[PDB]
C-alpha cells in the first residue's frame, strides 16, 4: 500500500498514515538508486 | 476515506511536491533501517566470540579440548515524538478568497490547506535535517534556547566517545595546521577489522573554499583536497573517499566511515512529517491542523568519528 | 514518584469501592472540564501535585516546585520518560488533591503555596479553599482536596 | 516418533495410570490457570478503577464532569525447574527378566521403565502437593534440611502479609482458647466486597480429633462451620484433613478474585529426552517438574499455629 | 454504525463481561418493572374496589341492588440522571502501546477503551447498588458528603412511613434486647391480605456475628426465622449480609403488591455518543445512569437501627 | 433488538442504546431464571 | 493434541511433551467435572 500506486484506495486514517510511511520509504529507495556520487 | 476527508485527500495529492531530505547524502543505502515505533526506547544486542586457549591437536584419543567463549553488549536508543500546529482557511471558504492570480487572504496571511501544509512540512524537514547533523534542536541562529532532549539521543556532531581535534584561533587561516590536526585525528581513529570501507567527509563552506587552494611554497597540479583524499586513503585501505558541503556546519570538519557495521541510522518509520487526524473547526473561516514527527535513532561505535573544530575566538 | 515501579509478591487488597481515590498515583483532577488549558513543560525535581514556577537560565526555561509571588501554575501529571510535566495555568480553575505541608489543614481553611509548592494554612496571593481534611498517604506525605480559583486582589 | 523412541511410547501408554494430585481438592475449578514457562519470572498486571467524586447531575448546560480514575499493580511470580534421575532395565534386556507374574530383579531392585516411571511420577506428585500446601520442599518428617527456594515462591501456609494467630503452649489442648484465636483471625480477615464465596479449612489429624469432641449436643466442628458461615454470607464451608500439617489450621476463600494459582503447564512430571546407556543392562532416565505460581491478596488467609512447647 | 463507531462496536463486544448487579437478589422477579424515562417525574395510579353493603338476594322482582364502589390513589416518583467521565487511549494509538500480553501505559495508567469502560461500568453498578440499598449517594466509608437528591427518591432503608425501631447504645451488644425490638417491629408490621409471601432480611456483618451465637442448642438466627415464619404463613425467609450497612436490620416482604421497583430502563450504565478528541493519544468518554424508582406501601418495611452511642 | 443476537446490526446510536437496554433486561431475566435460594 | 485421543501420532519429543501437558489439563478438567463436595 503506497500513494504512488493510483489503484490504492485508503479506507481509514491508519491506512493513510501507513501509505504515507511507505511512500517515504519508496522515495528514499529511489533516491539511493538514482544517486551517483 | 478520500470521499469524506478533504484534508487527507489534499495531503495525498500534494505529498509528492515535498523534496527529499538532504540527510540521505550523508549515509549509504545499507546504513539506514527503519523501525516501527513512535515514542519509547529500543534495545539492540550485539554478540561477540573469543578464543580461550590454543587449539587442540587431534591425535589418537583425547577428551579435553580447548573452548571458545562468548560475550554480549546491550545498547539502548531513545525516540521522541514532536508536534506543530498551523492555521489555514477552511475548504468550503476558499471560493470567497479565490482571486484571479492566487488563493488566500494576503492582508491576514491565510493560505489554503495544501500550500500551508507544504510550507510547514518543508520547515519541519529542515529542522529534522539540522537535528540529524548536529544533535540539537533550536530555532535561534545563536543556538540558544535549545529544547531539552532525552539521553541516548545524539547526532553525528555531538556523539560521545569520538575523536575531537581543535585548531587554535591563531591558526584559523593555516591549512597546514588544519591538516596537521586532521592527520592526528585520522591516526587516532580506530576502525578495527572493518577499516577497508569508504569514508565520508562533511565540511562547512569556508573550509570547502580553503580546500581548493593549491597545496603548500605553492605547488602546481596538486590541491589541499587531493592531499586530504590521499591522507584518508592511507587509512581506509585505499577505498573511496567522498566530500560533502553543508551550510549547517560552521568551522567544523566531520570524518566518518560509510560502513553499516560501525555507524547505523535506525530512524522511526514516522520520523518524517505526518498529518494529524484532528482538525480544529469553528464558526469562522479559520481552521487549525497538526503535524507530527519523530526524532532519534543514531547508533555508532566509539572512536570512529573524527570532529575537527576551528576556533575563532 | 507518581507510580513507583516496584514488583510485589501479593495483590494489594482494594476490593472496596469506597475510600479508594485518595492516592498519589491518582493524577488529574476530581472534576475536569473539556475546556481546561493544559501546558507541558520541562521540569527539574519532583513537582508532582505541587505549585510550580518558571526558571530561566543554554536551554529553554523549565519549571520547578515553588510558590508565593512566583507561582505560575499547578502540576497535575508527570511523564518521567520524557521528563515533562503537565501544568494548569493559574488563570484556570482547578479542583483536586494536592500536597499538604503537614496534617494541620482542616476543611474550609484558606491555604497558600509555600516555597516548596506545598499548601499550608494562612498574605494569600491566590484564592485556595480546602474541601477535605489532610490525609496521610506515605511516610510524611499529606494530600488535601483543594479548590483553586484565580488570584486574590491585595 | 513412537517407531524410534520406545520410552516415549511407554510413557504415553502408562501415563493414564497415574493418580491425580490431591491438591486439586484445595481449589475451585476457576482458581487454576496454566502458564507457558519452565524457569524464570512472570509479571502479572491487575487493573482497577475508582470514583474520584460524586456523580454529576445533567441539567441544562454543564462542562465540568466528575472523573473516574484507573490503577495498575504489578506482581512478580517466580518459577523453578527441578529434576530427578532413576535407574531402570533396558527394553532390549527386559526379555531376560520377564519372569512369571512380574518383570525385573527382586534381588537387585530393578524394574521396567514403565513401572519405574509410574512410581517416580507418583512420588514427585506427592512432593509437589507438599510444596503447594506448605511452601517448603523437604523429604523428611522433621521438616529440616529444606531446599532453598527463590523469593516470590510461596505456599498457602507461608504466604506473607496474612492473618497469623498463635496458640500458646500452655493452652495447646484448650479448644476454647484455640477457637478464641480462630475468631480473632476470622474478624481480622478482609474479604472486602468478595465475602460471598465458599470457604475452605485445612486441619491436621490431631486438630480433627479435638474438633470432633463435644462443644464446651453440638460439636466444635459445627460451631466453627457456623462461625465461618457468619462471614462468608452463609455459603459452603469445606473441611479437609492433611497429614502434611502439624498443629496448624488454614482458612481461606475459594474465590478466584482473591487467591489464584497460575502453575506452569509443565509443573507435573514430564520425561526428559536424555537416556543414559552403556554396555550393561541398566539405564537411567530423568523426570522434570516446575514449582511456583501462587498469587494471593493481602489479609485473606488465616493461619493458626498451636505451639507445642 | 459499527463500521463507523469503533467505541460503539467495542461496547457491544465487551458488554457481556460486566457482572450482574447484586441488588437483584433483594427482589423477586415480579417486583421489578422497567419504565421509559431519563429525568423527570412519573405518576402511578392504583385502583381499588370495596363493598358498600351486604349482597342482594335475587328473589321474585327487585330493583334495589347493593353497590360496589371504587377508589384511586396517586404516587409520584422522581428520576435523576447522573454522568461520569473517564480517560482512555485513542483507537489508532493502541498499536503503539500493545505490550507483551497486555495493552496500556503502566507508568501513566492509560487503558484501552474496552477495559476502561468495563471497569467504570462495574464501579458505577456498585454505586447504584449502594443507592438502592441505602437511599443515599456517597463514595466514602463514613457515608458523609452525600450528594443532594430530590424528594420522592428513597431506598429500602430511608423509605418514609415504615416501622422504625431503635436499640439504645446501652444494649448495643444485648441480642435479647435487639430481638425484643425486632419482635415489636414485626408485631407493628401490616401486611393485610398479602401476608402469605416470602420475606427478606438484610443484616450487617456484626449483626450476623451476633446472630450465629447460641440463643440464651438453638441460635438467634433460627429463633428469628421462626418468628418471621409465624407471620408470613410459614413461607420462605431469606437472610442476606451486606457490607454497605452499619448496625442496621431490614425486614420486608418479596411481594409485588406491597413493594415495587420501577427503574428507568436506562438505569444501568450506558455510553454517551460524545467523545473528546484532540491532537494527542488521550481521549475522554462519558457514561450515563439513572437513579430512582422504589415504591412501597405504608408500614411494610421494618428498619432496626442499633445506636452505637 | 439485542446485543446477544449475533445477527443484530444497529443502524444508529438510538438503536444501539435500545439494544443495550434490551440486553440488560434479558440478562436480568436470565439471572432470575438461574437463581437458586 | 492429547494422549487420550488415540488418533494422536506424535512427530517429535516437543509434540509429545505438548500432548502430555494437554492430557494433564484435560484430566484436571475431568476431575473437577466429576468432583462432588
From TrEMBL, chains A, F, G:
It comes from the Bacteria. This is Uncharacterized protein. The chain holds residues 187 to 223 of 230 of the full protein.
